[PDB]
Design a protein around this nucleic acid. Structure first.
Length: 116
DNA sequence: AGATTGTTTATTGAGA
DNA sequence: TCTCAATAAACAATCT
């Protein structure tokens, strides 16, 4: 039960960091991240919704994404803010990937959207 | 009751 | 032929 989708040629890591870093407070809920990613990359407004799980997975699986409690009172509370420590980002992951999509035809490097 | 969030385990497949 | 980003899903706990 597996298949690759014609997503934009940027890593989920890069797209997440970009939307976070461009938010007014440099922090966003998961919900806001998903919304903002689909706004910048229309593909994600479509039928396929598994990208939402993928995004959730990246947040927990890279050290550059640090969770911040929405309520100090509840350490196990939901709807927390996510932030990015940009210096903890492996720079190759911000480059445009060569995949089916980018072989057909934002910029080649997302660093100038992130190091802001 | 069903959806969402955060964490984790696991597999896949294509690019270097 | 080896790697790891992409993708799928289990599980617990909160949330609507």
């Amino acid at each position: 039960n597996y298949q690759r989708y014609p997503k934009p040629p940027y890593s989920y890591l890069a797209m997440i960091a970009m939307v976070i870093q461009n938010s007014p407070e440099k922090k966003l809920t998961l919900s806001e991240i998903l919304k903002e990613i689909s706004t910048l990359f229309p593909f994600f407004k479509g039928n396929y919704k598994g990208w939402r799980d993928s995004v959730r997975h990246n947040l927990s699986s890279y050290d550059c994404f640090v969770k911040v409690l929405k309520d100090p009172g509840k350490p196990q509370g939901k709807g927390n803010f996510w932030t990015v420590e940009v210096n903890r980002i492996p720079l190759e992951l911000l480059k445009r990937q060569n995949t089916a999509v980018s072989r057909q035809d934002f910029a080649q490097d997302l660093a100038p959207y992130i190091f802001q």
